[PDB]
From Swiss-Prot:
Keywords: Antibiotic, Antimicrobial, Disulfide bond, Fungicide, Knottin, Secreted
Tissues with expression: Granular hemocytes, small secretory granules.
GO cellular component, as recorded: extracellular region
Written domain comment of the UniProt record: The presence of a 'disulfide through disulfide knot' structurally defines this protein as a knottin.
Organism field: Tachypleus tridentatus (Japanese horseshoe crab)
Disulfide bond positions: 4-20, 11-25, 19-37
Protein name: Tachystatin-B1
Record carries keyword Secreted: yes
InterPro entries: Tachystatin_B (IPR020957)
Pfam (any one): Tachystatin_B
Signal peptide: none
Species classification: Eukaryota, Metazoa, Ecdysozoa, Arthropoda, Chelicerata
Amino acid sequence: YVSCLFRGARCRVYSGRSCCFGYYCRRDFPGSIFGTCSRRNF
């Protein structure tokens, strides 16, 4: 609702809000439902 996911946290595709500022969630493998949160450092 207000909080966000931090680095090294569990996050699924159909999870709640996105990761914290400067962070995103990535799937485990081609055809997964759950993943992890990683820094969106391009």
